From a paper:
Members of the LOV protein family are blue-light photoreceptors employing LOV domains as photosensory modules, controlling a number of cellular responses like phototropism, chloroplast movement, stomatal opening, regulation of circadian rhythms, photo-induced growth patterns and pigment synthesis. LOV domains are structurally well-conserved that typically bind a flavin chromophore (FMN, flavin mononucleotide; FAD, flavin adenine dinucleotide or RF, riboflavin). Upon light absorption, they undergo a metastable covalent bond formation between the C4a atom of the flavin ring and the sulfur of the neighboring cysteine residue. Structure of LOV proteins are conserved that consist of a core domain with ~110 amino acids that forms a PAS fold composing a central five-stranded antiparallel β-sheet surrounded by helices.
We recently reported both, dark and fully-adapted light state crystal structures of a short LOV protein PpSB1 possessing core domain flanked by N- and C-terminal helices. A direct comparison of the two structures revealed large structural differences such as ~29° rotation between the two protein chains in the dimer, an altered dimer interface and ~11 Å movement of the C-terminus in Jα helices. Substitution of the Arg66 to an isoleucine in PpSB1-LOV was reported to accelerate the dark recovery by a factor of 100 to τREC = 23 ± 1 min in comparison to the wild-type protein (τREC = 2471 ± 22 min). The faster dark recovery of the mutant protein is presumably due to the loss of the salt bridge between Arg66 and the phosphate moiety of the FMN chromophore that was previously observed in the wild-type crystal structure (inset). Additionally, the dark state crystal structure of the double mutant PpSB1-LOV-R61H/R66I (where an additional arginine 61 was replaced by histidine residue) is essentially same as the wild-type PpSB1-LOV. The overall structure of the mutant and the wild type is similar with the a root-mean-square-distance (rmsd) of ~0.68 Å for equivalent Cα atom pairs for all residues in the two dimers. Each protein chain of the dimer is bound to an FMN cofactor shown as stick models (colored by element: carbon, yellow; nitrogen, blue; oxygen, red; phosphorus, pink). The N- and C-terminal residues are structurally disordered and were not included in the final model in the PpSB1-LOV crystal structures (N-terminal 20 amino acids, C-terminal 8–9 amino acids). Larger structural flexibility and conformational heterogeneity of the end regions is observed for PpSB1-LOV-R66I dark-state solution structure as compared to light-state solution structure. Consistency of the global changes observed in solution in the current study using SAXS with those observed in the respective crystal structures further supports the signaling mechanism in PpSB1-LOV proteins, where rotation of two protein chains relative to each other causes large movements in the C-terminal Jα helices, relaying the light-activated signal to the associated effector domains.
Numbering used by the authors:
A (entry chain A): -1 to 132
B (entry chain C): 1 to 134
Write the structure that this text describes.
Amino acid sequence: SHMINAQLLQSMVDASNDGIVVAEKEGDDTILIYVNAAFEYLTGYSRDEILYQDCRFLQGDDHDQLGIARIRKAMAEGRPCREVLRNYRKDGSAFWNELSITPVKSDFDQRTYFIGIQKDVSRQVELERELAEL
Amino acid sequence: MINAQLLQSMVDASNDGIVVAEKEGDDTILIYVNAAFEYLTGYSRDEILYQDCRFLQGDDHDQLGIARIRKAMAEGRPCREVLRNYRKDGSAFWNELSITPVKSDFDQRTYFIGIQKDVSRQVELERELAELRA
Ligand SMILES: Cc1cc2nc3c(=O)[nH]c(=O)nc-3n(C[C@H](O)[C@H](O)[C@H](O)COP(=O)(O)O)c2cc1C
Ligand SMILES: Cc1cc2nc3c(=O)[nH]c(=O)nc-3n(C[C@H](O)[C@H](O)[C@H](O)COP(=O)(O)O)c2cc1C
């Protein structure tokens, strides 16, 4: 009587300020099958551009970031993980992405999907460094 | 095809508190809260459901943002305000609150999505850094 319906679930995901994505594993890729508006705003990429691609384009030229090894191992072991990564928007600007990945098993196909949540921590990091200097 | 199970998992994974409230008269009472909201406020889902979120203001009221929230809600505008809020144990924190009115043709009920996050540290840093800058 008083409880939410499924359209409300979509509304909560749409209202989120952090990016929220769903990806599915294929071989060495985990390809984006859903992104919310905040992900497009945060990354500068449109939904049409980046769907069915692995999120690693957000690392740009940066690789062998330690968090990436931790993510790969957590993915292999079926465990959730959280890493702060250097990421880059479509225009090339850098941001610090606090990224969480949660595997969830879909009852429909009994397939494991991966929920990402991207939070821009750049301002908090830079301000922490500035105050450390001060 | 993102089903309701996956949408729910996306809400459950959110770092930020996420709630749904429905308006009855001058109350908007909580009909859903996620785990991040419970951890942020220290209240369990069973304690706070079907109550207006204003209990989080505690002894405080007449904060300027509250007046802005009221006007924005009456006008159906989304809004964002940083409010002083209080946990179950009484501890104070700065809550960046984003309220989004839900537009739905399906049911007559008017709903609001709240998104809450603890900005206390960023506020502390901002004031300290501004003072030291002088
Ligand atoms: C659901 C999901 C979301 C992801 N989001 C990001 C992201 O926003 N930024 C990023 O740098 N990596 C993200 N990744 C990690 C990469 O997609 C990839 O798994 C990681 O770089 C390790 O794979 P690789 O060594 O083959 O590049 C995400 C991974 C998953 C599964
Ligand atoms: C969906 C939603 C979530 C809200 N969350 C909070 C909150 O977390 N903390 C808070 O102090 N007020 C929150 N509010 C605002 C109060 O519920 C209330 O609308 C505000 O105090 C102004 O109403 P009032 O002047 O009648 O007290 C929320 C409102 C809505 C609609």
